[PDB]
Write a protein that binds this ligand. Structure first.
Ligand SMILES: Nc1nc2c(ncn2[C@@H]2O[C@H](COP(=O)(O)OP(=O)(O)OP(=O)(O)O)[C@@H](OP(=O)(O)OP(=O)(O)O)[C@H]2O)c(=O)[nH]1
Ligand SMILES: [K+]
Ligand SMILES: [Mg+2]
Lengths: 180, 186
């Protein structure tokens, strides 16, 4: 039906994707859901299970990998991080747009399962001020749109526009009227 | 090579208000696009100026221009010719400026044939949203990239502006700019 969009935000480490995502979620003009990732790293002071992350053992995470229960996962410095599939599918089926915040290479995994998801790459402003740039540009080929994080407000506006445009796409709007 | 401007095509059914939305778009000083001034054979109306609203032409001259392949597209609407002159569109895109067409649906089909990567926006009546007329309107949108409802002129303008902004952020376009920058530093 009118399933919600899957919106995938990534970019190089330290680019400020968390900060931009937080700005997007402060905007009252839209209402998004957020996929809380699973991790095998230890819970740190102040963190709460099912809020910051779902904290699991390495054996549990690997059992879930085996059962195809992640849209994407990766291992960083000995700890798994990944996106549980069921929350995403259920939330989209309820009509809600859902954001994933993932690391860059994970887009290939997501696209295999959700080829029509909206992939947004957040680029550092050092690209617009201009070797390391080659690596950053190489990362982009997995994504649909590129937004420079020059200022948090401007980046948020650009992303909101991209999402609004996605809701106006003909294939989506056409299907809605056809099915009616 | 040189980064070309986008070709933006606004169309949709008779009487949906393409003219009114286009007019509002070009009253906005933040609008970056260049408007393609069409040729027509219809009579000039009170308040219109030759070379602003349209380039007004005779049927003989318009038909000679058709024969010489001087239109990206032309159509007949209510017994008059309307068409988009070719050189202005090509020159303006080549200078890196986005170009905006406001045209009827038969013309838009011809543009798609020549510019398959142009941005096609279908302006829909709010009657479709409210609840045979609908089916025909849906068939008309098949070639289009986006659908914008003309519920309010200001709202339609804003949706269009966002669509064009989003297309400027497309990775293929952005990736090609950066790949070129990196290459020409060498
Ligand atoms: N193919 C083509 N069409 C053009 C071109 N220029 C203008 N048109 C269309 O020709 C139609 C008539 O234009 P106009 O003569 O200026 O008349 P209008 O202002 O539309 O009032 P009228 O139709 O007489 O009540 C419009 O479609 P609508 O009346 O449906 O628009 P809309 O959605 O705005 O109704 C225009 O979009 C062109 O270069 N090529
Ligand atoms: K026109
Ligand atoms: Mg009209």
């Amino acid at each position: 039906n009118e399933k919600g969009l899957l919106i995938v935000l990534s970019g190089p480490s330290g680019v400020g994707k968390g900060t931009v995502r937080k700005r997007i979620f402060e905007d009252p003009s839209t209402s998004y859901k957020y996929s809380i990732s699973m991790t095998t790293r230890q819970m740190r002071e102040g963190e709460v299970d099912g809020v910051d992350y779902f904290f699991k053992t390495r054996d549990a995470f690997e059992a879930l990998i085996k059962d195809d229960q992640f849209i994407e996962y990766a291992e960083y410095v000995g700890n798994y991080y990944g996106t549980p599939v069921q929350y995403v599918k259920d939330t989209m089926d309820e009509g809600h747009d859902v954001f994933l915040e993932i690391e860059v290479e994970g887009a290939k995994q997501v696209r295999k399962k959700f080829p029509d998801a909206l992939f947004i790459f957040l680029a550092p402003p050092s690209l617009e001020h201009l070797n390391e740039a080659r690596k950053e540009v190489e990362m982009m080929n997995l994504y649909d749109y590129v937004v420079v994080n020059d200022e948090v407000e401007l980046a948020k506006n650009r992303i909101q526009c991209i999402v609004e445009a996605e809701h106006l796409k003909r294939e989506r709007v056409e299907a809605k009227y056809r099915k009616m």
